[PDB]
RNA sequence: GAGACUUGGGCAAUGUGACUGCUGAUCAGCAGUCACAUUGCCCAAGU
RNA sequence: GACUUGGGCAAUGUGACUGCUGAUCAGCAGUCACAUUGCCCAAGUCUCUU
């Protein structure tokens, strides 16, 4: 922090690994086990015409 | 994306300008302290 | 009666040393303002983009 030289180019954008969360690791199913099945429900708002 | 324009957060310096504060030495005046010199007086002794 | 030594009381001075005031001069420091041209970010308006 006592330097200042190291901030002339602060727009240094940061570059990171993507991960997916806990529920989307290793959730491929494989034969023979017991997986979930989760039905995506959906509700039209718009005006009825 | 290419850009122009403005306020910002700043980073720099090239200037330049003025402000403020302090130390030290010297001189002068005054006050006071150390020693020293001069003219006396008197005393203490010894021979 | 000379000779010697020492001390004390005086006055008349001198040599300096500090203390205070004022003045003079040299010597340092902390700043501040501000024109000039530069650099990196933040958010804006517009051409274009669309």
Same mark, same amino acid.
């Given at each position: 922090?006592? *330097?200042?030289?190291?901030? *002339?180019?602060?727009?240094?954008?940061?570059? $990171?690994?993507?991960?997916? /969360?806990?529920?989307? $690791?290793? *959730?491929? /199913?494989?034969?023979?086990?017991?997986? $979930? *099945? $989760?039905?995506?429900?959906?509700? /039209?708002?718009?005006?009825?015409?």
């Amino acid at each position: 922090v006592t *330097a200042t030289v190291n901030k *002339a180019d602060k727009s240094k954008d940061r570059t $990171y690994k993507t991960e997916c /969360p806990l529920e989307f $690791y290793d *959730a491929l /199913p494989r034969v023979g086990e017991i997986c $979930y *099945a $989760y039905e995506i429900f959906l509700e /039209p708002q718009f005006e009825s015409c």
